[PDB]
Design a protein around this ligand. Structure first.
Ligand SMILES: COc1cc([C@H](CC(=O)O)SC[C@H](NC(=O)CC[C@H](N)C(=O)O)C(=O)NCC(=O)O)cc(OC)c1OC
Ligand SMILES: COc1cc([C@H](CC(=O)O)SC[C@H](NC(=O)CC[C@H](N)C(=O)O)C(=O)NCC(=O)O)cc(OC)c1OC
Lengths: 209, 208
């Protein structure tokens, strides 16, 4: 395949880019790194920022999950119709990243003591994305414009993992709730989300969700 | 054509201001004091409840890296091709990761965390030295042979870390020379010497 994903055996920060690749009908190789292999240290020392994912597109080696998303967005035409839309796509993705960082901090560093406060704060964190949908064709299409973007896949993943963390959290957000259902029903993505290579990976690496 | 809406600090607008100044662009600063911000109405109107807010005509943007990428895209500071654009993103995302750690230290744990942060800092700066070493021996920019928005963000990151940990670039000859070279670009040099930069604090809590 032209693409290789090098990552731990979790969904994590590769979930969105995998959904993107699958929904776009692209082929890729998964190179699985166990935490054991990672402890040996040689792969880690060779990674630019000491972390995974690592991604290959031919001889182009990338690190940083959002760099991979933007690269696929640019090369597959999932980055808006013009410069204005591209900026709005970035604005969405940066918002998704901010909330993802808070989610990851909760999962890996403070789950038991922090979950109540996190869930309490969650509606205020989701509301900006509902607002964005409400300002774009009544929320009937995508997060920006009338074609899918890499930010849709990232936002979709963020919403899916938050439904596991806080079941019912989208009940207060009709546009986000319908958006999750609509994107999840896209045939190639629906098949991917139902497949063992997605279903049989945990969301995170520490057993919490 | 441009308006920057922000608190009276360098913070997350420092890099985009350096970009605008170095590119000879004109912009308006709309300063929001913490007092005005406490009133709540501006905050409630911001997409993510935060500043900076940026206007380019009737395009209103939020998110500091969105502003950087928008200026990069529209001013030709985003690599020569898709391959370079991906490398520019890879740099900027690395800058953002370290900036988040810096901000966490400054605003949430300065006193107890500074020693460990400075201890860890060489390992956090080394990737950017490595990136320079793989691009024309470090003699030009962080990616390719023309400046990108990631250069301005990386430059700011390096400048604030020199204040936090003086001498932190002494181990890194390419980063050291790079800071000196970019800082000497005539429009940027003038901006960095000007009161609108010098007389703003780096952060909003008096720590640096
Ligand atoms: C905290 O332990 C941990 C973290 C993770 C990560 C979880 C996630 O963010 O979904 S991903 C693995 C991690 N990489 C990054 O944090 C990449 C950040 C970068 N800005 C990007 O966007 O790509 C990583 O490589 N950690 C290893 C290390 O630093 O040595 C996953 C975990 O297990 C799967 C774990 O537990 C080990
Ligand atoms: C912690 O209090 C605080 C923070 C800051 C920020 C410092 C910095 O990151 O350099 S910026 C102001 C902040 N906006 C963001 O964090 C934007 C993040 C976004 N992902 C982006 O990249 O643009 C903000 O608006 N805080 C106010 C709020 O949330 O109500 C500056 C501060 O004062 C100058 C303060 O202290 C108030």
């Amino acid at each position: 395949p032209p693409y290789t994903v090098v990552y731990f055996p979790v969904r994590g920060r590769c979930a969105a880019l995998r959904m993107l690749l699958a929904d776009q009908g692209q082929s890729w190789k998964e190179e699985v790194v166990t935490v054991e292999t990672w402890q040996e240290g040689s792969l880690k020392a060779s990674c630019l920022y000491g972390q995974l994912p690592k991604f290959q597109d031919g001889d182009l080696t990338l690190y940083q999950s959002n760099t991979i998303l933007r690269h696929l967005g640019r090369t597959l035409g999932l980055y808006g119709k013009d410069q204005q839309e591209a900026a709005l796509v970035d604005m969405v993705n940066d918002g998704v990243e901010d909330l993802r960082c808070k989610y990851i901090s909760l999962i890996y560093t403070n789950y038991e003591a922090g979950k109540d406060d996190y869930v309490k704060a969650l509606p205020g964190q989701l509301k900006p994305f509902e607002t964005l949908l409400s300002q774009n064709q009544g929320g009937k299409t995508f997060i920006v414009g009338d074609q899918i973007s890499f930010a849709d896949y990232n936002l979709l993943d963020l919403l899916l993992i938050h439904e596991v963390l806080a079941p019912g959290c989208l009940d207060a957000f009709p546009l986000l709730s319908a958006y999750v259902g609509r994107l999840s029903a896209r045939p190639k993505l629906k098949a991917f989300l139902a497949s063992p290579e997605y279903v049989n990976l945990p969301i995170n690496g520490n057993g919490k969700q």
